[PDB]
Amino acid sequence: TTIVGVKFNNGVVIAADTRSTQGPIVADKNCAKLHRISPKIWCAGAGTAADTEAVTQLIGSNIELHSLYTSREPRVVSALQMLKQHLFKYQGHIGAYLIVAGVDPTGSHLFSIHAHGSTDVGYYLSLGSGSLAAMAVLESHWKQDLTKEEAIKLASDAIQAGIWNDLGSGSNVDVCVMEIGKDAEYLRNYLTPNVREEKQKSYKFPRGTTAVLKESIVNICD
Amino acid sequence: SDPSSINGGIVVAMTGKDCVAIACDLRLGSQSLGVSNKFEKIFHYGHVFLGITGLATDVTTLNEMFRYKTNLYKLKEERAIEPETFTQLVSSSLYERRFGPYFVGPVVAGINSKSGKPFIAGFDLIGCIDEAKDFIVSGTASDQLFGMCESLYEPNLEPEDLFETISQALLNAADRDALSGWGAVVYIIKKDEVVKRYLKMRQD
Amino acid sequence: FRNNYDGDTVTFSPTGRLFQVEYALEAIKQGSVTVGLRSNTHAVLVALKRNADELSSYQKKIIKCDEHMGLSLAGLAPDARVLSNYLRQQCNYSSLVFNRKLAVERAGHLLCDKAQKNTQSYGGRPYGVGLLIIGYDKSGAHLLEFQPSGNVTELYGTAIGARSQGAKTYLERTLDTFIKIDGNPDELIKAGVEAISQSLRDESLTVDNLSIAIVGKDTPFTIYDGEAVAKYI
Amino acid sequence: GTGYDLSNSVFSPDGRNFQVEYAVKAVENGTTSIGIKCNDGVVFAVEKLITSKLLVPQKNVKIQVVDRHIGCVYSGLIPDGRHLVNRGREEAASFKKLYKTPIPIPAFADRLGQYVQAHTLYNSVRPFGVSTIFGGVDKNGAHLYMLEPSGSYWGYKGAATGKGRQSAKAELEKLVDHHPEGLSAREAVKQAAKIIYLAHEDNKEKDFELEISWCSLSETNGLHKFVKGDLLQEAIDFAQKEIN
Amino acid sequence: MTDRYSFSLTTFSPSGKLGQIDYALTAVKQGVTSLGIKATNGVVIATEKKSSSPLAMSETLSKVSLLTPDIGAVYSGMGPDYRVLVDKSRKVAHTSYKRIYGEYPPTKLLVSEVAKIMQEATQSGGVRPFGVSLLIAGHDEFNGFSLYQVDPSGSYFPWKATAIGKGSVAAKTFLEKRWNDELELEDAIHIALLTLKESVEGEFNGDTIELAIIGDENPDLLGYTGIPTDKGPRFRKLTSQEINDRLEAL
Amino acid sequence: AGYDRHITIFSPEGRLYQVEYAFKATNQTNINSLAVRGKDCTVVISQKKVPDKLLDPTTVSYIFCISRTIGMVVNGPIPDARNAALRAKAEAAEFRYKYGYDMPCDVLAKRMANLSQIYTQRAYMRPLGVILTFVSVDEELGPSIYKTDPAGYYVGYKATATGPKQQEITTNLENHFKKSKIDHINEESWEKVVEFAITHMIDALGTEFSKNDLEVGVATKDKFFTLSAENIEERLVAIAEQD
Amino acid sequence: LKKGEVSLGASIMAVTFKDGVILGADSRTTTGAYIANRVTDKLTRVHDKIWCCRSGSAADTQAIADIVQYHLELYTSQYGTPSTETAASVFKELCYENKDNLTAGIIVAGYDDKNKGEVYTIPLGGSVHKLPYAIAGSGSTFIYGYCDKNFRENMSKEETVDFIKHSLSQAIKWDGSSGGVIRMVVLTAAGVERLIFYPDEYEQL
Amino acid sequence: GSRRYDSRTTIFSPEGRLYQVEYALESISHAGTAIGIMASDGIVLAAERKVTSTLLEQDTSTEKLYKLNDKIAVAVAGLTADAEILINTARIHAQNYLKTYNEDIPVEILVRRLSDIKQGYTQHGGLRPFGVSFIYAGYDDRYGYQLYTSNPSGNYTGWKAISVGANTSAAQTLLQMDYKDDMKVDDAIELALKTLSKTTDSSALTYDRLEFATIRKGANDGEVYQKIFKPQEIKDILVKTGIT
Ligand SMILES: [Mg+2]
Ligand SMILES: [Mg+2]
Ligand SMILES: [Mg+2]
Ligand SMILES: [Mg+2]
Ligand SMILES: [Mg+2]
Ligand SMILES: [Mg+2]
Ligand SMILES: [Mg+2]
DSSP states (O other): OOEEEEEETTEEEEEEOOOEEETTEEEESSOOOEEEEETTEEEEEEEOHHHHHHHHHHHHHHHHHHHHHHTSOOOHHHHHHHHHHHHHHTTTOSOEEEEEEEEETTEEEEEEEOTTSOEEEOSEEEESTTHHHHHHHHHHHOOSSOOHHHHHHHHHHHHHHHHHHOTTOOSOEEEEEEETTSOEEEEEEEEOOOOOOOOSSOOOOOTTOSOEEEEEEOOOOO | OOGGGSSOOEEEEEEOSSEEEEEEEOOEEETTEEEESOOOOEEEETTEEEEEEEOHHHHHHHHHHHHHHHHHHHHHHSSOOOHHHHHHHHHHHHHTTTTSOOOEEEEEEEEOTTTOOEEEEEEOTTOOEEOOSSEEEEETTHHHHHHHHHHHOOSSOOHHHHHHHHHHHHHHHHTTOTTSOSOEEEEEEESSOEEEEEEOOOOO | OHHHHSSOTTOOOTTSOOHHHHHHHHHHHTSOOEEEEEOSSEEEEEEEOOOSSSSSOOOOOEEEEETTEEEEEEEOHHHHHHHHHHHHHHHHHHHHHHSOOOOHHHHHHHHHHHHHHHHHBTTOOOOOEEEEEEEEETTEEEEEEEOTTSOEEEESEEEESTTHHHHHHHHHHHHHHHTTOOSOHHHHHHHHHHHHTTSOOSSOOOTTTEEEEEEETTEEEEEEEGGGGGGGO | OOOTTSSTTOOOTTSOOHHHHHHHHHHHTSOOEEEEEETTEEEEEEEEEOOOTTBOTTTSOOOEEETTTEEEEEEEOHHHHHHHHHHHHHHHHHHHHHHSSOOOHHHHHHHHHHHHHHTTSOTTBOOOOEEEEEEEEETTEEEEEEEOTTSOEEEBSEEEESTTHHHHHHHHHHHHHHOTTOOOHHHHHHHHHHHHHHHGGGGTTSOEEEEEEEEETTTTTTSEEEOOTHHHHHHHHHHHHTTO | OOOOOOSBSSOBOTTSOBHHHHHHHHHHHTSOOEEEEEOSSOEEEEEEOOOSOSSBOGGGOOSSEEEETTEEEEEEEOHHHHHHHHHHHHHHHIIIIIHHHSSOOOHHHHHHHHHHHHHHTTTSBTBOOOOEEEEEEEEETTTEEEEEEEOTTSOEEEBSEEEESTTHHHHHHHHHHHOOTTOOHHHHHHHHHHHHHHHOOSOOSTTTEEEEEEOSOOGGGTSEESOSSOOOOSEEEOOHHHHHHHHTTO | OGGGGTSSSOOTTSOOHHHHHHHHHTTTTOOOEEEEEOSSEEEEEEEOOOOOTTBOGGGOOSEEEOSSSOEEEEESOHHHHHHHHHHHHHHHHHHHHHHSSOOOHHHHHHHHHHHHHHHHHBTTSOOOSOEEEEEEEETTTEEEEEEEOTTSOEEEBSEEEESTTHHHHHHHHHHHHHHHOSSSOOOSSHHHHHHHHHHHHHHHHTOOOOTTSEEEEEEETTEEEEOOHHHHHHHHHHHTTTO | OOTTOOBOOOOEEEEEOSSEEEEEEOOOEEETTEEEESSOOOEEEEETTEEEEEEEBHHHHHHHHHHHHHHHHHHHHHHSSOOHHHHHHHHHHHHHHTTTTOOEEEEEEEEETTTEEEEEEEOTTSOOEEESEEEESGGGGGGHHHHHHHOOTTOOHHHHHHHHHHHHHHHHHHOTTOOSOEEEEEEETTEEEEEEEOHHHHTOO | OOGGGOOOTTOBOTTSOBHHHHHHHHHHTTSOOEEEEEETTEEEEEEEOSSOOSSBOSTTOOSSEEESSSSEEEEEEEOHHHHHHHHHHHHHHHHHHHHHHSSOOOHHHHHHHHHHHHHHHHHSSSOOOOOEEEEEEEEETTTEEEEEEEOTTOOEEEOSEEEESTTHHHHHHHHHHHOOTTOOHHHHHHHHHHHHHHHOSSSSOOGGGEEEEEEEOOSSSSSOEEEEOOHHHHHHHHHHHTOO
16 A cells, blocks of 8 residues: 655645555455545545544544534544544554545644554655655655645655555555645546556357256345 | 354355346355355345355354344334445444454445445455445455456446356356355346346365 | 431531431430540440340440450440441551551541541431540550540540439549559559449449450450459449 | 422522531531731641540640641531541642642642532532631742632631631731731741630630641741640740730 | 432323423423424525524524534524534434444434433433424435424424424414425525514514525535535525525515 | 422423522622623623632632633632633643644533533532633634523623623623624724723723722733733723723 | 554753753654654653653654643643643653553653753653753663763753754764754743754764 | 432332322323224224324324334334334344344234333332333234233233223223124224224314224235335225225
8 A cells, every 4th residue: 555645835635546455465456545534634544444444434423523513624633633542542453554634724734643643744744565665756856835736746656656666556546635725626546557458358158158057036025 | 263264155246237246155164074055145135135255153143133233224214225325334333343353254236226326345354345346256265256257257247148257257266265166156136136046066 | 397407417407407416426325324534554444234124135335446445335236336347447457557556546536537427428327326445555545435426535534325424523523533543453443433333323233234344554455244343343 | 489408409599508508507616716827837726625624635636737738727517627638638649649749738729629619519418517727838838728618718818717706807807907017927826826715705614725736938847737835835825915 | 429310300290291391391382483394305494593682692603503414403492402412413423323324314313313312301310301392304315305393202293394482383373374395495495484574573684593404415515526426415504695685585 | 399499300381490590699799790802802801809808819819711722700609610610621621632722712611501501401410600701812713702601501792791780781882882883892902902891891880990809811812811910000090091 | 662663763862051951852763674754853842841852652652742731731720830840740650650551761851930941851661860961762872971971060052052962963873763853942931942953964073 | 318309100009009100001091092903814003193283294204103023013102202212122122032033023022021121110210101002913923913002010911902092991892892803904994993983082083193004914925014004095095994
């Protein structure tokens, strides 16, 4: 997995690849690793997939309830403190490594959270097995005061570094852009550079090929 | 010692043109000993089918738990659960036991009664959802099925053709797995009708 | 008026009284008399025991709490059993943990606090027994009077129970005399018996009637019952 | 209708908690105790009634110390006072354990206050039947406080409670008017003894015993110590002197 | 100390009456009027903002609350009781449904959950019933639009239109005449405004009225773009100006 | 049946008398307070009455610093006032730890009001006989005044007054705001708002004040503080020139 | 230290001087040999003028500091400004009472008007030691000699900044688990000043 | 104390009756009548709605007839909300049994359990009882069609025809009159409806004021079918029988 977060002049962008693995097998060639915590707070997650979806949805739920109670738009520092205290409580057993970014009344934010409960703030961050390939890129092309267009490319390139060079990453690139005055724009499959070539033959079988012993109708309705 | 390798078994689900299919083998064994050749792993709650591979006591327990939960759902909601919804129920039920999980690999296949869109999903033992548009494989011959499916599968097949495809994916995957086989069953599911066919296969 | 303010200890009357506690203090007043008095070397407890018929035993009034402390009760006996048990435990803990003999002043403080808890909470009921505690610790001889309200007082001598006021006056008179009975246990006891015999009326103190206890310098708390009180009538 | 005074936490039609008010009556029927704040400490004094000659002189100590710098004296139901001091001690310990520094007097006061107030919140508990005068020295000066059964407390220059409270407060107002500069702990000890003796007239039928204690930055080191020996007799004499 | 009130405070009187429930319903009767009207393509719930002073800022007190993006509530009765019922309802929507099924509950079921909370206050130890009646309006895929009333006893019932509070009898009467099953949402908003005008004593305008509808999906209120299955909340509170614009077409 | 006036259960008229009696207790101290919002501040003024000459004036306050940003003025008996202050301080600290940002005045009010609602519904808990006025300069809302009461009600105000003579102060303020047409005192310095406040309290209660008769709290961005006798005097000495 | 969690490595120290106290630290965090964050801030504020330098487990120290910050905010609201000794005690209580599950070496430094600057070091066991200056972190081993030779009590701000700067550059020089920038926080009556020194400066000294 | 406010819901009257239960039964007698009639080939459940209007949504309504299982249903007389509490615990028990034994729960087992819960509120706990009476209509392989009834006391009994709620004496008399052991469902429908028509406290029996259900074993199938009549179906069956 490769996930990145890049801060730009009036916003933040996060991106991730879409390959899900179980050992050396690609269980899902197009999973989604960009989770919505609230409309304008999204989180990229790496590690144990069930854990990143679970911790994200739980905090997102509680964040939704906190917002309705306080009549205020959710803040990234809230999702951050809630996520981290939860992860710390479980001593690393909930394998969620996240890049939480978002815009709220106080501005644009980008933080990272490791499974054990520590957080970091930065202008560009990456996590996942592809973390090193992505960071090599971020360390080569990041510069301060990037434009929205430059940040999307930078974050997109970092993910590509991982897709190509990490066996733990692959398929497509998902991006979510959170700009200070606008609605968050989730760009699912922003880049699709790994389409399978057409197969050399068609494996459609002639009907009757399979030997059937018994056939019967299933009753659905009560 | 690997709870997911004690009893054996596989399940595969595929989507087609206004249809889905879910198939499974019929073996239940104890390590090398074949024990039953009538162990179906596909269950259905209304028009939603769920196949489950893994440790047999959990497979049986989960079917019973989902029947329980879908029965209550139907009573409170006054309508049968949909595939998208059930999928979320399975996931939440599996993650509830995150640190003492059921050793299974569920697979959901069905067609939404309102929109008619074919649906299939797979899960790992702790609930992570894999909503694929093509196929889902599970079991002790999952690698084999992935191999079969990746080659044999092509989008939008008609019920009559999907049958052959899923059947062959299943059959040949099982013949390369020591813990699977001893019979197979395929369900071809359409908006209105569901057909169940038992396949003839080697019994070794 | 009353059944409005005397149903629970948790209710203060308009004049600031705690009726359940005051009613508890009354059970003490219908109990048999017991005297306590001390010199600078010993502390004695003398107690008139009561029977039910002429075919029964005479209920014990003195309880040993440890080798250096004990008490005489008046009122509800089951309650004295509950409180002397606590004192036994508190004495035991001091020895076990600190290898220290519990001070009488501390025993009194502990008794007061235990009694108080039963006067501020609902559902409970005050203790209905009074106790005279004598002991010999690092600061010498001691006599303490405990009342169910939680009030514990250190004295030279005293008495509680029905007609207690008589002996209380004898002691109050004989003070200058008994406070000096040092080194002579038997005399102190005799003063205690003289004292207790001023609260008699029904009969004369006999061998089945009297109970005495003494503790002091080289005397571990010891209870003399029946047979051994003959020499004091 | 009626019955608003049988259960503790009940508000009467005019907003009063009658049970708390009856508790005050138990306090007024009690011995007089006072506190006098001085230029660098506090002095506490209390009247101890001699129910009889059988009471051992100087042994039934009523003033209590909390931690090593707080003195507490109260009037009313003595056991309730002991109960409040036991809590005070647990609270002072908790504070020192977590923060290392001995509990500031304003912090301690509120600790007592919240606990007492807590006993006016439910019908399952009875309010405290005592008014407590307490204080000591901390990081920034001396402090004297008085706490009522309602949980109400404020800081004082001098304080009095019990049967002779009015004479005491009267005498106390005299001291605060004549000496605005402050009062030395030595003088305060003398004056406290006086005030108690004078206050003692409001209960002139029984003989009494005087008990004084103080906490002073110069005479006791900011630690609480009872006034014993020479110091105590000097104050007793000064008292039996200014009476006639 | 401790809640020793483990017994019921609501008990049956000799006539079979549940005293505390009847008294709570009386509390509801003295409350401001609130109504709800169900149309073919929407539902409108409305109430008057009985500001208890002109120094108070009436906007900081919402009587019409969002429970889920497709469900709203209004009440008549004791405001604080409603406020806590709303918190509990928003929460249960998550705990007993979203965290299990990944979707918000259907109106009837959320209604059923609030009702249970109210029933228990009618039997559990040491509590008095809630002094409020709620009108919950919402939409969901399989049931469409619905309006429900929930009483202090916990009984709930579905309505085409109804009114609760002070002039509910007169208002329920105005609604019975005006209501028919071919009304578009704008027409219901209209009838709602008319019905409310009669219950309202003084100034009737967008700053003294609170109206909300459950209608079409509002993508401009979602906050993000990109996911096509979730099209936006159907709940929308009308602004001060939106109400005024409709009051002029009286 | 007749005990319906002792615990929080409905009377046959649907009233909760214990809540009503809790509202009468708030007036037992005979202290009035008012709060107004400036352009970027919020001021609360409360009378200070020290009767007994034996009291230390520095400890008599009904104004509490809840957090670095929220201040609270209580109209009610001191023990209930302090019970509320402690809880509010704990709630405010816990909120910051859990959510990563300072608890808003309005949210603190809602929370304290919810706790009050509970005493109204559960028979074992008695309502507290106090009214709480919370003030701050919120980072999102600007100057704020939210007041909660024994019934569990709370709302935000342009300005507000509380105490036995609440009505006189309220009508005074009401008149000023109908005259000026804005929801706040149009002054830049909190010092002038404080003056406005004191002036209107004097005009309303028909009473003159010295420095030891007032208590003042001011809320500005990132801080809430109380004025000293001497700071108040400087306010008093500045007002004795318009009047 | 748990398998695979982020480590602070670090070169941190706090030095008291005439005007008050200065805290310094590097900015590198590691997961093995990978630098997870090369610009971390190990100087944490638990109160206006009470800060701490964190070393050990990143998660543990953040959790602890977050709780001390809370305890001090509540202390403040009730009893006024806390002493550094009190802040150290709260830190100690948490470190000592949970010694089995935490890896946190914390240096607490703070400024008060009565006490001037103070430094308390809370090493792995949970013991507290008040000292003139303290060094910790994995890079500290290398500067024990240098620091003991060059520290003098009552130095000036300029001199202290220099001492901290030279010490940490040496620590950073030799320890692989230390690197990045040198951050400092100056605590005095005047206020709180944040300083930062880049590699190009400290590396060649 | 708190004893003061306790109504003592679980005590016996001097005559050995349970106060609260007797008072709950009184409440129940004011609820719309629910009737259940057992035939050789099915069961009928009919009920009259309480508190209605022209504006109430009858389509989306259910306040008297609830499905507990695909083979068991209840008719409710009393407080709807209390009923829903119990109904849900019954729905769960039915599923617990199915999970445990892999067979549908026999009717009496479900009925007994529910009654036992009601009984509990009768002997311990200090809570008011549930003001509900149920008529259970159900089928199982051991006894076939069954009809039971339970009241606040927790006593339950079995019937061939029964009613609960308002005007039971009258309804039972009419049922006992026209009921014959060999009845057919179509015939039971008529009787149930006839009976309600003659006992209603309101003008005329109209569809909008009813809830109707039958549990039949349609000979052209096998599984027992529970049918909750829809408004228009109640209007239709009301005409055929002759009430218009
Ligand atoms: Mg596998
Ligand atoms: Mg095989
Ligand atoms: Mg074989
Ligand atoms: Mg007074
Ligand atoms: Mg209450
Ligand atoms: Mg109560
Ligand atoms: Mg280095």
